[PDB]
RNA sequence: UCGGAGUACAAAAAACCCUCCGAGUGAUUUUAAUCUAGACAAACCAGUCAAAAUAAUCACUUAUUGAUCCAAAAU
């Protein structure tokens, strides 16, 4: 009983009449390539990609953007082009090259990324730690504004936060300092949001941070709703993920429901959902930049429940499910003898009348 | 007692990042009919075209997660002859920075044979070891 | 089961306690000539004692 | 005394481990390129 | 496997002929 | 040709394998192994 | 463990020190055994590991020695993470 | 199997049993997996395991094991020392 | 020799899928190869059947020179199985509250 | 007695004084370890895989082999 292919049958296209007139990938590589190609398509029978939580496949994105900066194609080509023509053209270049000496200006390297491109891979970076799905749900931002946060180490020093990466408490103890470029018409909220970690409520976030019409650059003249409280991860897991947002908004808005009291420690206090207060001033605030941090439990944090809260301190473990052993058998066939002790109940002689 | 003492009993960490991170999470073992070793939370993957070196950071998901790439204006217009060592060498250097950025210090590379030997990805290498990333991807826990 | 014994004031602990009085409450069997050697203690009601 | 004479057996016989160790790995070392040689020479 | 639409995928050496 | 049986003998202790060699003798029998005792690579030496 | 006479001030800081971990926000050291059902082995059980923790702590002899088989994800992390704090401004 | 002794009218063991099985309190029969001490060298270092292991004998055997054995090696044991008295109940067993 | 689990088959870490004399099915996601060519559960879970893209390892060389001679348009298929885990990980839970 | 193909066309199994091929071992070096979840197979006996936990290849590769007891050996 044979069946019908359902559209294409794979490699069907080629000839077998005439093989040795065919072109051949005499190349490990080429092949590689053309496989993966093959790889990356929609075949119609079941594939990897089809079981395997592709997540969701295709989606179509609910887009909350800052509208795309607009410039000129053939300009830029033809600048592009002729900065090159100089470039190549330079022999001292090209001596730097053969013999194998040059270096890159990484910093001026990390303007342009933050320049061109350099959004998207925010963009997909969020993507990856999944700040969309926590925070937006549905949606997709391109972060158009560089974003770039900090904490004083030491008098002389700076812990950076780069989205994704890693920072201890023993740094977030202290306000961050911020620096984005605006003129002042601008009103601006920035926000900062614990996205996991949240005890009793699964679905919902803390705000630690939350600042409110601020003009510029001006860090400090901006209105805080929420003064700032330290990150606090659990002992035992490991790893929230504490992001930085920054929404454009054109008329002042001002929101006493979402007030809190000046110290602010009571952890019900901050409950919050990035979703729902973004429903409400939506039509205002447009979501702009974005930076975030991975920590981790670490030992000041200790303080904080105990300082702070009014807490005892939680700590947590991780769980592997007990092996999976059969229904015992009342004569186990060709069993070591140890099979016994699979079934234990615990391990002590229990003399059940004596 | 206090009304946020409230804890309750099993903790939702809901970021995938996490156990990665912990090394507790799942690799995928397998294939090993086939090639490269899919086992990785993350990977380094080096596309060399005649033209541009572009070389990736990977997710078993597909996903490219960081990459450098010799298209993208920033480092093409920094130095000259795409196809160079020097390039190579470049862009490795562009990812390494980029990667503890990222944050991410492992990921697993997978070379050919022959191209193991080649200088362009010997110095490739270099880049990303004095970038402070390391390969070879730290152990699973309880496998 | 020792517990259980004085308990029921079968042994009495007031008197010295050997094998003999232990047998005499029928709390526990022993025959010689089986190789038994006589009887053995374990903890089982240790924190009941 | 027993027990004495097994671990002074270990002592000794560790002492001896890397001597014995590298004196065959040279041996066998010296072997593969004295069959190497006889064959290059016995090619030629 | 003949019963389905799919049999025939991995086949291949009328792909290379090496006889 | 004949395959035999010999015993190999570790350096410290007691400690024994147990297996053959080829009659034409390519390769002759010395090996680095592993002993139980003080849980070490020695080298194993042929024995009878 | 501040109101603990029984062993000296050395002795009694020095256990906050490594075990801070499981003390509690009232002073309280606090020491855990399990496993067998006869709690007087759990009573033996936990005054040894508190005679292990007086040892240890009592021994300034007490190197601390630590394994790179756990941490070199730590270590590594940790200059990774050292690299970025490495930028230097004034802040605040 | 002698089921009537002649002097005593009593029923008779095999002692051939007894030297190679041992039986449990619960009623399970084990023994030695065959050929363990036979060709060695001959042998993959993972079937050697599976030789040198104890196992379980099931019912069949074990009835049939009963019948050739007498009441006194299923009586209950309680010896010093015992390797195998950790084993002889049987723990969880819902059936 | 033969297909020991199919298709939607829930398994645990071990159970044998399938064994065979050459290779006809090949281990894909979470499915392990014994030396005797079998395929068999390396996490708890689905069986799923697919096939995919043969990319053998060039430490291979008949596989190699497969590839080698093929036309430029086409590509090698062969069918794999996998296990797709069902239990997570793991869980999180609060041991002591201090 | 053991193994490959047909007989047995697609999971398994399957006889014949049925059709055809083989095995009673070579060749090496890299000496291929302890310990244990879960399995295949199976009347029994034997046979096979194998994660975590601690420190073998090539010859179509599949076959290259015998249980108790009894003897000789030492650990
Ligand atoms: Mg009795
Ligand atoms: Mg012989
Ligand atoms: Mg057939
Ligand atoms: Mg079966
Ligand atoms: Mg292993």
Known sequence: RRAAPLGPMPNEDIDVSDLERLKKYRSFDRYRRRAEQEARKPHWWRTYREHFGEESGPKDRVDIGLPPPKVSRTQQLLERKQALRELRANVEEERAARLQTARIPLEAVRAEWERTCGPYHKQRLAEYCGLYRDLFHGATFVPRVPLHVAYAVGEDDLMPVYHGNEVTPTEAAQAPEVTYEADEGSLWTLLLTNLDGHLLEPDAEYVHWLVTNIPGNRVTEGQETCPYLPPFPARGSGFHRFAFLLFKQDKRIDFSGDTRPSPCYQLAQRTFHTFDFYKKHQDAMTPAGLAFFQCRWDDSVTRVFHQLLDMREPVFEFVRPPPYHPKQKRFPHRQPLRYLDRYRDSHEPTYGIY | PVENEAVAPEFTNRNPRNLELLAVARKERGWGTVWPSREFWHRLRVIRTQHHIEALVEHRNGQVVVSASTREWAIKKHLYSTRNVVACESVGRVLAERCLEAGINFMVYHPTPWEAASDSIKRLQHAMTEGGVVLREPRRIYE | RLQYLIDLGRVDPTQPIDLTQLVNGRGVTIQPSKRDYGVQLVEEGADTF | QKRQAREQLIEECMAKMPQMIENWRQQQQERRXXXXXXXXXXXX | YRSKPTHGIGRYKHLVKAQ | SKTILVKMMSQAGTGFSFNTKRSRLREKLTLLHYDPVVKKKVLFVEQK | LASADWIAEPVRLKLAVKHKNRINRSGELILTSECSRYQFRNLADCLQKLRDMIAEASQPXXXXXXXXXXLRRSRIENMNRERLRKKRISSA | ?95 | FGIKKMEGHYVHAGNILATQRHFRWHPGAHVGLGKNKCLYALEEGVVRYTKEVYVPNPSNSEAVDLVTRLPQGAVLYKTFVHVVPAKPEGTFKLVAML
Request: proline share 1%; glycine share 4%.
């Open chain 8, 1 to 95: 199997v002698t089921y009537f002794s002649s002097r005593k009218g009593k029923r008779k063991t095999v002692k051939a049993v007894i030297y190679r099985f041992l039986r449990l309190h619960s009623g399970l029969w084990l023994r030695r997996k065959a050929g363990y001490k036979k060709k060695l060298w001959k042998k993959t270092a993972a079937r050697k395991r599976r030789l040198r292991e104890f196992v379980f004998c099931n019912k069949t055997q074990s009835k049939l094991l009963d019948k050739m054995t007498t009441s006194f090696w299923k009586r209950r044991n309680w010896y010093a020392d015992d390797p195998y008295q950790k084993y002889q109940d049987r723990t969880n067993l819902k059936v």
